[PDB]
Structure formats: structure tokens, C-alpha cells
Design a protein around this ligand. Structure first.
Ligand SMILES: Cn1cc(-c2ccc(C(=O)Nc3cc(-c4ccccc4)ccc3N)nc2)c2cc[nH]c2c1=O
Length: 125
């Protein structure tokens, strides 16, 4: 297909372990962004077929979205908080390098990124 398989969200042989930062990433960061008015373009992988973006996966080499991030957190996929932060950053980068700077999608991404950074700056140690 035009669309890749979605990113893996299960880590079957990794031990399950909570950390304060991962709890924060799920219960504060992801929860706040997931419920935001502008979350909808970002809650699932970009469907280049339905959205008619035949070049999307030519430009975007590392697809990422909040649906994948949510599942990863809910499955304890990440070994540490920085991996999860990196996925958020990748999501936003993809949006900013593919879409035109004036597009409404970019304005929505910036509002979410602002909120993301606001929450990340209060990440527990
Ligand atoms: C990251 N990213 C994402 C999307 C994306 C992803 C999903 C949608 C989607 O679901 N639209 C939708 C919206 C409505 C709706 C919403 C609000 C009010 C009324 C109607 C209804 C149906 C559909 N289908 N749109 C754009 C996208 C496009 C171009 N570039 C990107 C991009 O980089």
C-alpha cells in the first residue's frame, strides 16, 4: 500500500516497569494533548491514501502519531521517558517539514507543541 504498517506498540520481551516520568508522560502529557481541541489530525497514523498525500511517506521517513504514542505508553513499550519525548518531537517535526508553514495543520501542531513543552518543562526528576 501507499501506507506503511503502523509503528509497533507492543514490546513483548521487555519487562514491565513504571517510572515517575512515564506516569507523568501518560497521565499528564498524553492525556492533556489527547483531549485538546486540535488533537484529531494527530491521533492516528497519516492515511496517505484517504488524505491524498502520495508523497507523504517519501518525505517522512519516521512516521509517528499520538495514537501510537498512547498505545506505547499504555503497553509500557518505552524503556525510558526520553524515548517517548523523542516520539512526540518526531511527530511535530514530520508535520513541520511536510506541510506548508501557513497551513492550519501547522498552527494546530504548534498549539499542541506549546502545550507539550509546557508540560515537559515540569517533568519530575
Ligand atoms: C499529521 N497530519 C495529519 C493530517 C490529517 C489527518 C487526519 C485528518 C482527518 O481525519 N480529517 C477529518 C476531519 C474532519 C473534521 C474535523 C473538524 C471539523 C469538521 C470535520 C472530518 C473528517 C476527517 N477525515 N485530516 C488531516 C494531514 C493532512 C495534511 N497534512 C497532514 C498531516 O501532517
Amino acid at each position: 500500500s501507499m501506507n506503511p504498517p503502523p509503528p509497533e506498540t507492543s514490546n513483548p520481551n521487555k519487562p514491565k516497569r513504571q517510572t515517575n516520568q512515564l506516569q507523568y508522560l501518560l497521565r499528564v502529557v498524553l492525556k492533556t494533548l489527547w483531549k485538546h481541541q486540535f488533537a484529531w489530525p494527530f491521533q492516528q497514523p497519516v492515511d496517505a491514501v484517504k488524505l491524498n498525500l502520495p508523497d507523504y511517506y517519501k518525505i517522512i521517513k519516521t512516521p509517528m502519531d499520538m495514537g501510537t504514542i498512547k498505545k506505547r505508553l499504555e503497553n509500557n513499550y518505552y524503556w525510558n521517558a526520553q524515548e517517548c519525548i523523542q516520539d512526540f518531537n518526531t511527530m511535530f517535526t514530520n508535520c513541520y517539514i511536510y506541510n506548508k508553514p501557513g497551513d492550519d495543520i501547522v498552527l494546530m501542531a504548534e498549539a499542541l507543541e506549546k502545550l507539550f513543552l509546557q508540560k515537559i518543562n515540569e517533568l519530575p526528576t
